[PDB]
Amino acid sequence: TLPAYNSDIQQALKWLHNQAPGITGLIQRKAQWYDRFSRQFWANWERDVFHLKTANPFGLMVWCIILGTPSKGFGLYPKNSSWAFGRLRQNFIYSGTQVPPPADASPGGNFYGGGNAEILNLDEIRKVLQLRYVALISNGSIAYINRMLRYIFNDDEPWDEATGLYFYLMDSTGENGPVENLAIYRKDWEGMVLLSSSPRTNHVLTSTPASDADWPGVDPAASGIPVTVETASATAPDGSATVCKLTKPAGSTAYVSAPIDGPLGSGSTVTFSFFAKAGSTRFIAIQSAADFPSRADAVFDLDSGNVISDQMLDSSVVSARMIRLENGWWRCVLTTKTVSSSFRAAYVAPAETNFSWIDSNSSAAIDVLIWGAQIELGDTPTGYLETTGAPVTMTDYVLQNAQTGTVKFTQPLPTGVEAYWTGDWKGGTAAEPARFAVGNGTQDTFTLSDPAYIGLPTSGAFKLEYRVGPALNLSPQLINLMNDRAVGIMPTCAGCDVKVIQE
Amino acid sequence: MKKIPLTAVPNQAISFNAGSSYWKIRLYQNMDMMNADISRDGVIVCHGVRCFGGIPLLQYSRQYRPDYGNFVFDRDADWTLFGDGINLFYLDGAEFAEYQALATRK
Amino acid sequence: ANYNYIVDTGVIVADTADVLSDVEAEFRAALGANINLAASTPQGSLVAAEAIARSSVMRNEARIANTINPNVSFGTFLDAICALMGIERGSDLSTFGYGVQVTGRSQTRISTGSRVQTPAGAIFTVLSDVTIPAGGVATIDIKSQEYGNIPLPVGNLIIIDGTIGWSGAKVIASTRVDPGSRQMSDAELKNARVNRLAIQGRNSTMAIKAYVSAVPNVTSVNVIENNTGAVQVVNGVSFTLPYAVWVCVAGNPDKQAVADALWAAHNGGTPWDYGATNNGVPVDGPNGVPVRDPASGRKYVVKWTTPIMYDGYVNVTVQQGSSSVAPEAIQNAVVNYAQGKVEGEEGLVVGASLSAFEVAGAIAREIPGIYIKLCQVACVAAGSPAPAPGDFTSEYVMSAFGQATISVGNVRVTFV
Amino acid sequence: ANYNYIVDTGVIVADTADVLSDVEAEFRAALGANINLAASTPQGSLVAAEAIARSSVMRNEARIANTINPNVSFGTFLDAICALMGIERGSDLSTFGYGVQVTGRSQTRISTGSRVQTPAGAIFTVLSDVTIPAGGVATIDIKSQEYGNIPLPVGNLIIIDGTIGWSGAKVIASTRVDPGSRQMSDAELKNARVNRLAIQGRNSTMAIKAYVSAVPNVTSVNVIENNTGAVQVVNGVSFTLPYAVWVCVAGNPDKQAVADALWAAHNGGTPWDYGATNNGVPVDGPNGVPVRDPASGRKYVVKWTTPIMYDGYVNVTVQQGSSSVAPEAIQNAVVNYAQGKVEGEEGLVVGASLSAFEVAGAIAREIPGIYIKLCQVACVAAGSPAPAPGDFTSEYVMSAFGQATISVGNVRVTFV
Amino acid sequence: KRILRVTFNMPYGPEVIREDLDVRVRIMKAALRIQNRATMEIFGLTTQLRESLLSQFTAWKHRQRQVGREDELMIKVSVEAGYSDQGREQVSRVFVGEVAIVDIISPPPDIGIRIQCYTRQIDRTKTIRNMPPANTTFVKFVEWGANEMGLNFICDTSYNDQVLKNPGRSITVASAILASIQDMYMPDVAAFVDDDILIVKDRDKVIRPDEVTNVNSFVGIPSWSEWGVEFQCLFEPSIRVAGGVAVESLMNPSVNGNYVITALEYDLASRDRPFYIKVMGSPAA
């Protein structure tokens, strides 16, 4: 139970037999034999009993007797005994009457492995035995059968639709046909950025400041001159030399507070996004305001691309993230949830040290290049929209027809911007972006591109069909043997005809 | 529902008249587990029954109808805590059927 | 000193023994290199004893390792294999009741007064009861043994009386239930396990077969899923509805119990087909047993049939070789095989066929050395006279609906 | 000598006193009738060796004799058996906090095993050495001493074992507190197996009933199954498909949750049907609602109906007794009974007919002593004018896809 | 440390008389129709304990009064004896029966009572409630007797399936049932009552073959007798009446073998030397 059990066989060796050959030799060899023929035997026999690892063909048989499957379909015994065709296989066994040490061409060769019915890879023998057990315990539940198929043939791993793992069972119901939860992204100089079908607003008054008076600089200590926004001549991601330099002189803890309509909203998730380029410093800190002192802090390392600091003075912070863009640009996104309506502003500052705050001390003057500020509701960054003293509201698109997949836009897509979609339509799900349109600068209505996989309903009562193979690259021997009905490995309701086949 | 007195020893044999039958359980420490040899009315019913908590001792229906009863451990068997901490309970036919009904829907 | 592993043909770990050479080789090269290991010496006796012990250890380990697979298991070990799939061991009980007694005047019919029938009845009264002075009272009964016994519906005899109690009459008001008997099963559990391999499953042909087999009194059951429904006929038994499961159960179970089991394994929305007239014997004709859905709603209808009873015959001719006396063990062997009490070879089941070669095989199994000569079988309907020697052939078709039955007196043996 | 410790009723293992005596006697008979088997002698050493052996095997076979019963297996054998149904014993990991801010001074060095501590117990250890930069703050990696989902909230993390220079540890919002796990025990593993058995031991109707009764806000359910291959009414619901199941869910539940339960309980092959017109309000449009399979992103529609909502009106003409009672109490009692808060009586479940005798029973139930002269009940469609006097009946029979609700204002009590 | 308890049953409850008081219990049991006897001398009784026990023990209220329909008519007392060392107990049960006689043997300053109990002293039972069988087998008559007495039964004999015409309708009270079962078939198969279990078996057979008691240590010497072997032993809480014994002697090598028990003589004295049980045994077949 608890107080040990020893049972060491060698316990029968007193202090007298310290330098003895004999007694010690006999007891050691007896212990080795009892070990090899009891502990090793039971270890490898438990490995036999284990089915996820019934390697030993002996185990696969013991289990096929346990489950009840006829043994005619299994191709156990060691392989490499068929001549057939190829240097990788055996050859004709001839009358080497004098016993040549190569055993003529080969030591033998037979027809063991007759195709179209016989499986040879023991890995799939374990699978088919497990499938028979599932059939033995099955009530017909499609969810259970499919989850067990996934657990067996994929070790409970999610699969993409570019592979097409095991499919449904008897449930004469195709989910879709219409379009639901459709999300469009556009691919452009901003990267892969989604668009909304509902009016979304960016509440910052200015996103590209070309004047000092545009955004004020506030400093509680006011030790040094305020942080001044300078019109910088650098290649902005949109394609202009209109970025703004943001510089902190020595001994200054000032910060820029972008004007924005207040309040923003009580108990609403807030997303701050902006485009930054590494400059004199290497990192920039931002703060989302709230009631004093419930503000949230974050620090973005423009080079390493890590959110090395997320500070919760309250329950504000939810997440922070970075997305990369060409010319070494980064969009830094802060998602914050606060129940108070005191969201007055968002503070921005260059960071001297990698954990510098909005009011950290400045050893010298550090300047960074920023452009395209966007504070919005919701919890996801959206396409940049120019704001000049206006909390700009816009609706990206309207889905005019939800059958053919044609969708119109507020404005035509610029030349080169691509469009990706996700969701479900035509009885097929696209959990990954799928391109369907390229902008030409004159057209705003575009038709969606086909998603995945099979029309799906498989019209018919009381009966359905399996689908498998492009993912697992399974053997046609497996496909045919499982397609056989008599052996009864597939789970089956009494009174439902299911053919396995498929790919 | 009758509590069977136990003694904190590794190997023991308890014989008693319970449920209109003459039961005798020999409980012994086998390696890191406990096993029980159960004999009813002299004729031995089972050997080497590994003992667990809540799990019935006479595991097979032939050993417990018509309303012969069963023995249940509250916890995993451990002779160090026998008497004080781990008790073995005997159920007659009706109580054991009710226990089966409760334990088969969990 | 080896464990042979019959990979797929014998499924059993076999000991090799021959460890005497190994133990001698250990006594040598560890206790010395020149020891006279010849017997009649202390070291030789020690080596022989040690080799015997190792052979015993290997044998016991081989037995325990082999017990994991059936057909080489036994009690409380094959028990485990059945309990893995929930094949329930099948407990010990017995109960009768609802009997009546014709007697004299105000007789104190004491408790456990016993009665007997033609097939060794031995049925006792349950409790003490004093008969009413009218001349007939109602009593309860218990059988002595734990085997399935079917008293005939005629008043036969009495065991324990008081010279006033005339007879315990058996009428339609009587009742009856199933006693099983350990693992009855000792080697026919090995047969019943492969059938009841999917008791835990539901909504399947295997599931319905196993679940209804778990019901008392069902010696066998035949289920056809009838899945390629275009009416037509599939695997025997014509098919009134395209999509419908056909069920035939042998034995004499309680209609309510078997119907509830069939409804429990209902397979969703597949109806029940039992028509085609001669295909089986309908339990209730049209509008079968109602039963009640556990999901409280509606009263459905479950339809199944009872197989066609057949009376089998076996004409054997034996030589009685090797000077071995065997007057009438042959019919006992035949009836055992037909009842299915032999291991591996289920006898006359609802789907079985009466085979001369199979009967001869059972006879040779139970008693070799008699050199069976002819084993003609034939068969007749439930009643009917003897089939005459002309009809004695080597096989009867015994289509999927029906059931043969071999009586003790039907088998005859001709000694040459 | 060794007898047969295998037998048939499991392995019978004897005590080491017995096996030692047996080996002693065997050695005595082999070597010499008067050889000293003292433990200090070579022969006694051999006897003790053969006593520890020949007993280890006894205990091994006894411990793994009935190893394929899942309800009594143990350890890795239980793991293997339960893996056949997908149940898998987990792994015991630890909370793996990363990026924990470390505030200190100068260039303090944090070494492995710092043993930091959360405010509420939960001791964690540093697993990588880090030197604080010139900023005075760095990031550290910590792992849980114990196993499981140890809480690591954002807050003032304290230090148990700290060097000179370390000021504190902060769980900033950027710390990726990765939860651990505590594995799972054999008893709860058998619980999971028995739960799986209960799930896979039900037919379609009962499985659907249980799954949708598990959902909250589901007051009652009605499950119906065609099983006829003919479009017709079976006991009151006009079907529209030959093989289908019509299910009705009461209350005001969550549509996605009840769809999940229905989908998990789907038998398969048999589709749902919304029924014909006025067969229960067909919510979710003409097409069934969509549900994503948790097992596969592949996708299935499921159909269920809500019952016809009815306003039940009750007239009662009780007479006030010696004890004063208020009509509001009578209305409250009627509403309580109809809602179903009363013990025993189901209430106005789906397909529960409106009996004035039933509501009078509930009223004389809750308020005994009062005398009731005339009780009448009536049923009207929702949002409709109340029926005029005389339209009421003494009992209203109700269809199989509706519920009737009585509010406080739908009871008219008159004191005679 | 001998541990001996005399546990009475009275309306207040059980009043256990422990081994601290001077107690001396002489129990004599046998495989006969006779009720097994227990004579127990208890000294050191306080006035209150004496009034609480001796007043309840009486032979009245059933002769010159009525006050009787069931138990509580006479006090039922059990005896629990054994050893105890290292904290573990061995208290088994050695007697269950009702008192019949009360006296004092030792006058002051040690007022010590001596009370006499017999097993199944409820013989003034309900004058046979259920009628005996008219014509039945021996086993079924035994079952009727056990059911009437309320005791569970162990019937193991080769005479069970022998019909008796008219088995015992001259019986007047419940006690005479045992005398009748003893009267019929009395060369070997003698029925008795041990505690609350009615045992009907052949005299050369053991109640529980698996419960043989290997005996190696005796007090004195295991000697021969007319029937089998007779020997005294220290109190072992595993020796019953009619149980199996596996005598393995040293002084007498010829008495080795397996024996069944016929008579038992317990003599247990907490504060005196005699703490032995004497066993009469006969060859077991």
Side-chain angles (χ1 to χ4, degrees), chain E residues 142-206:
Chain E
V142 158
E143 295 191 327
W144 166 87
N147 164 277
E148 157 85 344
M149 295 207 286
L151 322 154
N152 62 315
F153 72 110
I154 309 185
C155 167
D156 163 75
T157 186
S158 61
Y159 282 93
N160 49 309
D161 41 34
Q162 304 221 338
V163 317
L164 330 179
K165 157 195 114 175
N166 287 329
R169 320 272 283 227
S170 268
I171 290 165
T172 84
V173 282
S175 57
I177 289 162
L178 175 66
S180 305
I181 304 173
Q182 153 104 342
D183 263 37
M184 18 185 85
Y185 294 116
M186 168 187 117
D188 55 333
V189 54
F192 61 95
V193 176
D194 182 271
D195 295 346
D196 42 36
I197 298 171
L198 164 85
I199 287 135
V200 193
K201 65 183 203 32
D202 302 347
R203 196 157 145 288
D204 43 6
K205 313 206 52 73
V206 192

Side-chain angles (χ1 to χ4, degrees), chain E:
Chain E
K1 159 193 301 201
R2 329 186 170 151
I3 167 155
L4 170 49
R5 309 204 209 283
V6 170
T7 307
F8 292 89
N9 294 303
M10 339 186 83
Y12 333 119
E15 306 86 340
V16 159
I17 283 197
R18 252 99 195 179
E19 62 273 34
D20 322 317
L21 317 93
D22 204 304
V23 303
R24 283 192 83 275
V25 186
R26 305 200 282 306
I27 314 185
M28 192 145 88
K29 298 220 202 215
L32 276 91
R33 55 146 308 252
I34 329 177
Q35 322 181 18
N36 43 306
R37 172 181 69 59
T39 315
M40 334 156 284
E41 323 173 16
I42 321 293
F43 328 128
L45 274 312
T46 84
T47 309
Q48 173 194 120
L49 257 186
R50 259 177 278 134
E51 307 288 15
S52 90
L53 290 153
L54 312 175
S55 93
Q56 312 286 357
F57 318 139
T58 168
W60 299 123
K61 315 327 294 172
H62 90 101
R63 204 182 81 121
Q64 47 92 15
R65 212 61 57 200
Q66 51 104 32
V67 198
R69 264 134 296 284
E70 46 175 66
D71 293 51
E72 189 149 355
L73 219 76
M74 195 32 173
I75 293 324
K76 165 223 270 173
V77 52
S78 35
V79 191
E80 299 184 342
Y83 281 112
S84 156
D85 180 36
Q86 294 169 313
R88 175 210 79 101
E89 256 70 23
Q90 227 186 20
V91 285
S92 70
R93 207 172 61 164
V94 300
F95 185 78
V96 163
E98 291 88 19
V99 200
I101 306 175
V102 171
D103 203 303
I104 304 200
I105 38 165
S106 158
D110 54 345
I111 295 95
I113 83 162
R114 186 268 292 297
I115 38 160
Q116 264 263 319
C117 308
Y118 300 83
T119 298
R120 205 61 37 198
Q121 199 71 10
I122 45 185
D123 47 32
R124 73 151 291 291
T125 312
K126 256 284 309 184
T127 312
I128 301 276
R129 252 186 253 108
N130 307 7
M131 288 314 211
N135 259 267
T136 196
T137 68
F138 190 66
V139 51
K140 306 283 180 253
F141 171 54
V142 158
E143 295 191 327
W144 166 87
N147 164 277
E148 157 85 344
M149 295 207 286
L151 322 154
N152 62 315
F153 72 110
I154 309 185
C155 167
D156 163 75
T157 186
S158 61
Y159 282 93
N160 49 309
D161 41 34
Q162 304 221 338
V163 317
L164 330 179
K165 157 195 114 175
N166 287 329
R169 320 272 283 227
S170 268
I171 290 165
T172 84
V173 282
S175 57
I177 289 162
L178 175 66
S180 305
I181 304 173
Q182 153 104 342
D183 263 37
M184 18 185 85
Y185 294 116
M186 168 187 117
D188 55 333
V189 54
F192 61 95
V193 176
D194 182 271
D195 295 346
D196 42 36
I197 298 171
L198 164 85
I199 287 135
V200 193
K201 65 183 203 32
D202 302 347
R203 196 157 145 288
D204 43 6
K205 313 206 52 73
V206 192
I207 48 176
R208 264 171 290 296
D210 55 310
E211 304 273 19
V212 85
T213 322
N214 317 296
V215 184
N216 218 326
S217 267
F218 316 78
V219 165
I221 175 183
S223 280
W224 287 104
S225 68
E226 329 178 16
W227 321 83
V229 67
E230 54 165 77
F231 65 94
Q232 222 167 248
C233 269
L234 274 194
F235 184 85
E236 262 279 7
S238 52
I239 287 153
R240 308 278 153 237
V241 157
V245 155
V247 165
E248 283 140 22
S249 163
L250 306 94
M251 311 275 297
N252 247 356
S254 62
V255 294
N256 301 10
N258 306 278
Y259 294 82
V260 83
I261 298 179
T262 85
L264 256 182
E265 284 86 355
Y266 291 78
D267 187 10
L268 321 183
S270 56
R271 300 178 57 66
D272 203 347
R273 175 150 171 271
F275 204 73
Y276 324 114
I277 73 146
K278 185 184 142 208
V279 201
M280 287 263 135
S282 43

